[PDB]
Amino acid sequence: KTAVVDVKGAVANPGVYEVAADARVRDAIALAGGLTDEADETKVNLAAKVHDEMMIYVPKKGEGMQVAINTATEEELMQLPGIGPAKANAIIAYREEHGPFRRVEDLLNVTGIGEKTLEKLKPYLLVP
Amino acid sequence: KTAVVDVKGAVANPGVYEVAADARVRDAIALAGGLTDEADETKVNLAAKVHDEMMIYVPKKGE
């Protein structure tokens, strides 16, 4: 009636814990100390039951799926919503002319990326 | 009672190790110096039971 689970990912104390088979993913994460500041509880089923030998992975915002605007290529840049050849090549032109981007809001200074455009792009970015 | 396993992949010291049959993959990988900075931790279950002649391959990120 006991389960051994590998609680890893964006949890405070990742390890191999021992809990009751009637426990649920939330309990195992609670025992592990909660979520780190980079976790994404969106993609975790906190209600799912625990079984022995189970692996509980908590991914981080991204996941991987983040394009580093400062060090991306035209092919990688235009992989995001809206950004195409000319919009991707202006973000790269601004990269090389007026320097790299400090924050996500620096994209607003690029021609073609307005407030509407930036909103459908924020969660897929990685601005050093 | 005894289980011999081959720990390969993104571990500090891959190779053959001996473990108790009642052990988990956590123990086998602890004997090899644990994972490395390039191990795809999402591809390794340390709560898994170990059996004799078992091969434990830890893939890298990007494989």
Author numbering:
A (entry chain B): 62 to 124, 143 to 207
B (entry chain A): 62 to 124
Verbatim from the authors:
In contrast to ComEABs, in the ComEAGs structure there was interpretable electron density corresponding not only to the OD (amino acids 62–124) but also to one DNA-binding domain (amino acids 143–207) per asymmetric unit, which contained two OD protomers again arranged head-to-tail. In fact, we could model the DNA-binding domain in the ComEAGs structure only because it made fortuitous crystal contacts. A slight tilt between ComEAGs protomers has minimal effects on the ComEA inter-dimer bonds, but it causes ComEAGs to form a kinked-ring rather than a closed ring within the crystals.
ComEA, a DNA-binding protein widely conserved in transformable bacteria, is required for this uptake step. Following this contact with the tpilus, the movement of tDNA into the periplasm is driven by its interaction with the widely conserved periplasmic protein ComEA. A ComEABs contains an N-terminal transmembrane region, a previously unidentified OD, and a C-terminal DNA-binding domain.
